[PDB]
Amino acid sequence: QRERRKRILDATMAIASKGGYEAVQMRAVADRADVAVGTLYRYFPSKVHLLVSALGREFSRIDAKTDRSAAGATPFQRLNFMVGKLNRAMQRNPLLTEAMTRAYVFADASAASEVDQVEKLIDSMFARAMANGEPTEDQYHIARVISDVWLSNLLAWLTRRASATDVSKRLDLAVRLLIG
Amino acid sequence: SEAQRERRKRILDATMAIASKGGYEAVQMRAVADRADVAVGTLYRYFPSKVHLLVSALGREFSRIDAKGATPFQRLNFMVGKLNRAMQRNPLLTEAMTRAYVFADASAASEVDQVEKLIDSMFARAMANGEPTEDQYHIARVISDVWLSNLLAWLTRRASATDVSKRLDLAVRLLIGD
């Protein structure tokens, strides 16, 4: 059932990248992934669960892309590195970003687990970026603040009250204010 | 020149009261117009949507609170504390404002801007005990974003009020902690 999951999340990412939040239909994803619809619902009860899970997988893959050794001599530099990478990744995929941001907007208690998995991952990614070895509590907290700035400005990006570069500027400002 | 002002005041008062008692759903143009004793047409000329109503009312709220610690950290900590307690005393109002801010589009981008500048100012001056630096304004923005993100989590029952309070405290200490 692992390969089934892989096909389902693959189709989720493909469709989301192609047509944004709207295009992510349960029937369409199930179709594209060659699984029964009931199977899809059994693993993912909503498109929110689908998208958040897919996001989690994407983060888990990005963390496996290289290694903690792969940069900067200072915490500020390393965190700047991580945030910059994820930032350009965001800028390269506006539709996917729309789908994910919307998914986060609609995520409720029923998707708690899924969302948690994302939050735990991304924060970890930031924290381990700042730290040499095991991150401290404060670094986890800093990670959470950065994530909150990111999401809050994506909220304004989604409703076209702000551009992607505005988001990027806010992120850099936040990083500098926290550990610059 | 005074009829318009009185009208606006009653409109925002009604918005605050209704939002406080029933939340975002209860904020409807006819109900607001009714309570405020204005024509619905006048209300639509004044505020095109419930988002404009809630955002404007919030702005007036921060203006009013603005009207009537030995460090930046203590003063900001104090203010965020008071605002937090006020928030927990008014969950339906907070619900209404949160929905208003997550649902706000470009058509209210102007309004959303104004109140924003207001809110941050009140934070920043609190940090400065006077005229703030650029960085203090920036910090105010960061705090505001933490607030909004955690309020989104609260709205969708992914977090409690206590969670929100703790997150805001953490943000304050991490940003300007003594």
Side-chain angles (χ1 to χ4, degrees), chain A residues 141-159 161-168:
Chain A
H141 297 334
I142 293 168
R144 191 92 300 262
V145 172
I146 286 158
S147 292
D148 284 343
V149 175
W150 210 312
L151 172 60
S152 181
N153 284 278
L154 279 187
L155 235 51
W157 173 80
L158 186 65
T159 53
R161 281 186 287 114
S163 65
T165 311
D166 290 340
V167 178
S168 183

Side-chain angles (χ1 to χ4, degrees), chain A residues 105 107-109 115 119 138 141-142 144-145 148-149 152-153 155 159 161 173 176-178, chain B residues 101-102 104-106 109 112 135 138-139 142 145-146 148 150 156-158 167 170 174-175:
Chain A
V105 169
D108 53 27
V115 178
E119 287 198 2
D138 265 19
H141 297 334
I142 293 168
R144 191 92 300 262
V145 172
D148 284 343
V149 175
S152 181
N153 284 278
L155 235 51
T159 53
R161 281 186 287 114
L173 277 183
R176 183 201 137 252
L177 285 172
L178 288 159
Chain B
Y101 269 90
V102 299
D105 62 343
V112 169
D135 281 347
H138 296 336
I139 290 162
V142 178
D145 287 336
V146 176
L148 186 58
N150 284 280
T156 60
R157 308 189 67 84
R158 289 186 292 107
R167 290 290 186 193
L170 281 174
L174 286 170
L175 285 167

Side-chain angles (χ1 to χ4, degrees), chain B residues 3 6 10-24 26-33 35-44 46-64 66-67 69-81 83-113 115-116 118-130 132-148 150-172 174-178:
Chain B
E6 225 298 288
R10 297 205 311 279
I11 287 172
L12 294 178
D13 289 347
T15 291
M16 289 299 302
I18 295 174
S20 182
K21 238 183 68 178
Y24 195 75
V27 184
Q28 303 177 218
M29 306 296 292
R30 287 172 183 78
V32 173
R35 194 189 173 106
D37 185 28
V38 299
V40 193
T42 298
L43 180 50
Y44 258 104
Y46 252 86
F47 304 93
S49 71
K50 75 197 292 172
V51 160
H52 292 71
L53 279 177
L54 290 174
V55 163
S56 299
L58 180 59
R60 191 187 66 160
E61 266 304 298
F62 270 75
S63 288
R64 284 181 164 185
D66 182 37
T71 65
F73 167 74
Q74 295 179 6
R75 298 186 286 264
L76 188 62
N77 191 35
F78 179 84
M79 174 168 295
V80 173
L83 291 172
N84 182 268
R85 279 125 66 182
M87 181 171 71
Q88 303 201 49
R89 273 190 301 264
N90 271 255
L92 298 195
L93 173 65
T94 307
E95 187 266 1
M97 294 300 180
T98 307
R99 290 205 179 273
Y101 269 90
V102 299
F103 283 171
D105 62 343
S107 90
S110 175
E111 286 73 11
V112 169
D113 233 52
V115 46
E116 169 172 312
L118 190 46
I119 296 180
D120 297 340
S121 176
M122 294 186 48
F123 286 154
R125 295 190 71 91
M127 298 178 226
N129 214 10
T133 65
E134 235 97 347
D135 281 347
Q136 285 172 330
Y137 284 115
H138 296 336
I139 290 162
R141 258 300 97 197
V142 178
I143 289 300
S144 295
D145 287 336
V146 176
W147 214 310
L148 186 58
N150 284 280
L151 274 184
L152 177 54
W154 171 78
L155 179 65
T156 60
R157 308 189 67 84
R158 289 186 292 107
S160 61
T162 297
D163 294 332
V164 175
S165 181
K166 273 169 177 172
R167 290 290 186 193
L168 287 171
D169 289 346
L170 281 174
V172 170
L174 286 170
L175 285 167
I176 59 171
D178 288 318

